[PDB]
């Protein structure tokens, strides 16, 4: 249970729920076929925001994960329970208007992921123990303009069967400045990119102890 509730850019937090479309409830999406898998949604409720956050292409945005919208600390329990082991992931979608695009459908491309490392530590654990900070590089070579950023943590502690994996995501609204447009990513759809049978979605992280992990979705886009 967690929310990507604000975004930091060039050292500046853009504000709670400002430019990030936040639910007030921190529960996961469970059905990868639901429209809610794109930018969260029913049975949650997601607020709108008229802020579109500017970021220079090639630089990083940092999603700031918190337990609840009311959480004001940054200790592990203020981020997400440490049972919730799994990957962190981030995607972009080029859109006409970052405040009105729903995010549902084709156009997403993956720009970051962190599954399990060679020490057995998961991407969510680095966020939990790193003040909720999930740092994500905006590629230099993409087209400038309006985008959605979908940042995600997947908790796998109850994922032995499907349903079971817990998908926590929110969409931020970006104005990417300075992208060269030299490369146009191949894209996937949400819903569509994940399936309940994926090896990183239906997975026992206990039996046997997990030593490698396949993050769901497409390969990371690179310039
Ligand atoms: C910008 O975001 C990228 C991820 O998109 C970060 O790169 C990762 O950094 C971690 C921590 O050092 C490494 O373990 C990974 O190997 C890096 N991944 C890649 C693909 O390079 C990067 O550190 C972030 N930069 C800043 C300044 O926050
Ligand atoms: Cu939870």
Omega of the bond leading into 139 within 30 degrees of 0 (cis):
no
136 in ligand 1 pocket by Cβ < 6 Å?
yes
Q: Which two tokens stand for residue 137?
A: 């590089």
137 in ligand 1 pocket by Cβ < 6 Å?
yes
DSSP classification of residue 77: G
Calpha distance 37→34 (Å, rounded): 6
Pocket test for ligand 1, best of 115, 135, 140, 151 (most atoms within 8 A of CB): 135
The helix/strand/coil state of 78 is helix
The helix/strand/coil state of 76 is helix
Beta carbons within 10 angstroms of residue 152's beta carbon: 27
Q: How far is CA 206 from CA 129, 200, 203, in A?
A: 21, 13, 9
For tokens 């940042």, name the residue: 151
Calpha distance 222→78 (Å, rounded): 33
Pocket test for ligand 1, best of 87, 129, 137 (most atoms within 8 A of CB): 137
Calpha distance 43→25 (Å, rounded): 9
Residue 42 backbone dihedrals phi, psi, to 5 degrees: -50, 140
Calpha distance 100→54 (Å, rounded): 16
Among protein residues, the one with the nearest Cα to ligand 1's atom 27 is 60
> How close is the Cα of 163 to the center of ligand 1, in Å?
31
Q: How far is CA 193 from CA 55, 92, 112, in A?
A: 26, 14, 15
Secondary element (H or E) of residue 207:
none
The span from the first CA to the last CA of the chain, in angstroms, equals 34
135 in ligand 1 pocket by Cβ < 6 Å?
yes
Q: Which two tokens stand for residue 66?
A: 């918190």
The helix/strand/coil state of 188 is strand
14 Cβ contact partners less than 8 Å away, ≥ 6 residues apart? 6, 7, 8, 20, 51, 53
SS (H, E, C) 79-130: CCCCCCCCCEEEEEEECCCCCCCCCCEEEEEEEEEECECCCCCEHHHHHHCC
Side-chain-side CA neighbours of residue 201 (13 Å): 16
Pocket test for ligand 1, best of 57, 60, 115, 116 (most atoms within 8 A of CB): 60
59 in ligand 1 pocket by Cβ < 6 Å?
no
Domains of the chain are 1-223 (2.70.50.70)
Calpha distance 167→160 (Å, rounded): 14
Calpha distance 170→20 (Å, rounded): 7
Beta-bridge partner residues of 174: 53, 147
60 in ligand 1 pocket by Cβ < 6 Å?
yes
Nearest ligand, CA 83: 2
Calpha distance 136→187 (Å, rounded): 18
Active site residues: 157
DSSP 6-73: EEEETTEE--TTSSEE-BSS-PPB--TTSTHHHH--TTS-B------EEEETTSEEEEEEESSTT---
């Amino acid at each position: 249970h967690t929310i990507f509730s604000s975004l930091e850019v060039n050292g500046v937090n853009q504000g709670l729920g400002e430019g990030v479309r936040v639910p007030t409830y921190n529960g996961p999406i469970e059905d990868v076929t639901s429209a809610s898998i794109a930018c969260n949604g029913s049975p949650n409720t997601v607020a709108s925001t008229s802020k579109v956050i500017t970021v220079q292409a090639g630089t990083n945005v940092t999603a700031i994960w918190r337990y609840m919208l009311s959480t004001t600390g940054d200790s592990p329990a203020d981020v997400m329970d440490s049972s919730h082991k799994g990957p962190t992931i981030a995607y972009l979608k080029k859109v006409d208007n970052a405040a009105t695009a729903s995010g549902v459908g084709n156009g997403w491309f993956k720009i970051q992921q962190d599954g399990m490392d060679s020490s057995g530590v998961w991407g969510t654990e680095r966020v939990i123990n790193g003040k909720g900070r999930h740092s994500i590089k905006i590629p230099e070579c993409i087209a400038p303009g309006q985008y959605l950023l979908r940042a995600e943590m997947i908790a796998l502690h109850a994922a032995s069967n499907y349903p079971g994996a817990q998908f926590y995501m929110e969409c931020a609204q970006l104005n990417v400045v300075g992208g060269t447009g030299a490369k146009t990513p191949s894209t996937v759809s949400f819903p569509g990119a994940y399936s309940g049978s994926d090896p990183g979605v239906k997975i026992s992280i206990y039996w046997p102890p997990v030593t490698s992990y396949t993050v769901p979705g497409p390969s990371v886009f690179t310039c």
